[PDB]
């Protein structure tokens, strides 16, 4: 058992393990989104790249949480990882809307954990979220929102043209 | 006559010579496709470049087969090369559909030769196809499929615009 | 739907998706093993590093399979990922024994898929496993076996001493 | 008298001066621990180096607090520095246990000051501790805990052997 644990509640420990699950779930979702846009009958490489990069980012966030759990003397506990919500993700617009929904849910979990940390007077936890998660998440959601606006502007009456142009001229490929 | 030939059937030797003919035919087809897209009244440089590169690739595949024939102590035998199926190749979409048909026929010839090799217990032949042909062909067909999907998405109600944009923004020029 | 799929059975497609699940499960197991050896009350950094590296390797194997699924025109389908078999992994010896069991199960899945590929006359699948999976797996299992032998030799009557020395002098830290 | 002081309570000012004393006390303790492990009849250079480095770190923490006191317009007030708790520090294990006790006491003083800052609505103080003290302290305690676990594992029935090996193979020398 740990000889280091100090000021680290069971409630925070448990919430950290749940958050890890949420981040790995998100990572899995992005993995599926990336490979859907790699299909020969979808074939939007920039969209594929965007979501593959997010899968790695979410995995890295989970790993940081797990590292922190150990630093504080809590015990990492892994649960089953549920499969993503869809097998096929529709259009770029559909996908980007789904990603924003997912990110808003992750963001709310971060805010909830921050509030728990605050209530438990755990300033290290609060600091950790502030320093490595909250601003990263705000910046990502702004980026997604910007992308959504551009995708929406391009639907017009020529959806295929607009979806191609967005992938070619906004996304890195 | 050869002093080296070992485990190399007449059936495989003949099938290798036929495959050489198929690859040189494919090369000739791509040569014609490249020069059609170089016409002043077609003028799609990226499409021209794509098919010219494929002509060279197919020629190189034939040359590898011929080198292997000699390595095994078989005798290269050349036949007439039939001219390509069309004199004019239509749209980029028409052309890319024709290329996929051609590649699927080459792929099936590779698979047939692999099966013959397997039946004749000729592991060098089998290895050779696995190592230099089968994955190269799968990768090319995936690329073509991706291109076809993008071309199809761009037809919309503005075909000329879409054909220009594909050539400018997907193909190397 | 795909316009490229050729010689790719439904049976192989399904087996590839199952294998992806097995590799991601293995990755998750190694993630848990790595963080267990990072606990302050375990504190074997070289062991942690070893299993973290394996988590990444297994993830990369899954990604290669998914890329290949798309190259062939099959459809990636993701399933729930079961949590690892244990929450706490015992000694270095216990852990390395569990890893070998896991690797032997992955190896047998690769061999089974190879046999299916052979039966379905799918030489691209067979080649793919030969070229990127079978030898990598044999090499990993040999490494694990070597490690197990060294760990076993060091138990003696001074288990803690031996476990420290193995981590310091065999594993990269 | 200061012309700058704003939102800086007398309670925080006093608590900052007390914390400075605690950090300089800790520095003095580590100085004594370092020179004990430099004795010819102890002679554990890596252990000496470890504690000498900590003496400098604790001094640097005090200096940062003093700099911040002045930045806020408070007045540094120095008190007597009590000598360390022991003249001789026993084994490496004894020493590392004493260091963890000391660090836990410093950590609790940081948490107490953070709570006071929070209650006094002094976000600069809170930020300062979060940014330069809380995570540094968590990381140090994790390191010490890891070291303690390794030292404990090496006691076995051959304490001298284990103490030598830890110093040679874990600590920088
Ligand atoms: Cl379960
Ligand atoms: Cl003739
Ligand atoms: Cl389900
Ligand atoms: Cl005095």
UniProtKB/Swiss-Prot annotation, chains A, B, C, D:
The lineage of its organism: Eukaryota, Metazoa, Chordata, Craniata, Vertebrata. It is found in: Cytoplasmic vesicle, Autophagosome; Cytoplasm; Autolysosome. PROSITE patterns: FERRITIN_1, FERRITIN_2, FERRITIN_LIKE. Keywords: Acetylation, Cytoplasm, Cytoplasmic vesicle, Iron, Iron storage, Lysosome, Metal-binding. Oligomer of 24 subunits. There are two types of subunits: L (light) chain and H (heavy) chain. The major chain can be light or heavy, depending on the species and tissue type. The functional molecule forms a roughly spherical shell with a diameter of 12 nm and contains a central cavity into which the insoluble mineral iron core is deposited. Interacts with NCOA4. GO terms for molecular function: ferric iron binding; ferrous iron binding; iron ion binding. SUPFAM superfamilies: Ferritin-like (SSF47240). One of its GO terms (biological process) is iron ion transport. The modification N-acetylserine is found at residue 1. The gene is FTL. One of its GO terms (cellular component) is autolysosome. It comes from Equus caballus. CDD domains: Ferritin. Residues 6-155 form the Ferritin-like diiron domain. Stores iron in a soluble, non-toxic, readily available form. Important for iron homeostasis. Iron is taken up in the ferrous form and deposited as ferric hydroxides after oxidation. Also plays a role in delivery of iron to cells. Mediates iron uptake in capsule cells of the developing kidney. Delivery to lysosomes by the cargo receptor NCOA4 for autophagic degradation and release or iron. Belongs to the ferritin family. In horse spleen the light chain is the major chain. This is Ferritin light chain. Residues 53-60 are annotated as: Catalytic site for iron oxidation. InterPro entries: Ferritin, Ferritin-like, Ferritin-like_diiron, Ferritin-like_SF, Ferritin_CS, Ferritin_DPS_dom.
């Amino acid at each position: 058992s740990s000889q280091i644990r100090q000021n680290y509640s069971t409630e925070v420990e448990a919430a950290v393990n749940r958050l890890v699950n949420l981040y790995l779930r998100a990572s899995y979702t992005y993995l599926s989104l990336g490979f859907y846009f790699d299909r020969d009958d979808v074939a939007l490489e920039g969209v594929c790249h965007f979501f593959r990069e997010l899968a790695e980012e979410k995995r890295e966030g989970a790993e940081r949480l797990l590292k922190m759990q150990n630093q504080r003397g809590g015990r990492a506990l892994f649960q089953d990882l549920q499969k993503p919500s869809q097998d096929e993700w529709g259009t770029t617009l559909d996908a980007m809307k789904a990603a924003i929904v997912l990110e808003k849910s992750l963001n709310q979990a971060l805010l909830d954990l921050h509030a728990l940390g605050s209530a438990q007077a755990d300033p290290h936890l609060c600091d950790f979220l502030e320093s490595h998660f909250l601003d990263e998440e705000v910046k990502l959601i702004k980026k997604m929102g910007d992308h959504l606006t551009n995708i929406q502007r391009l639907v017009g009456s020529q959806a295929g043209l607009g979806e191609y142009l967005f992938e070619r001229l906004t996304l890195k490929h």
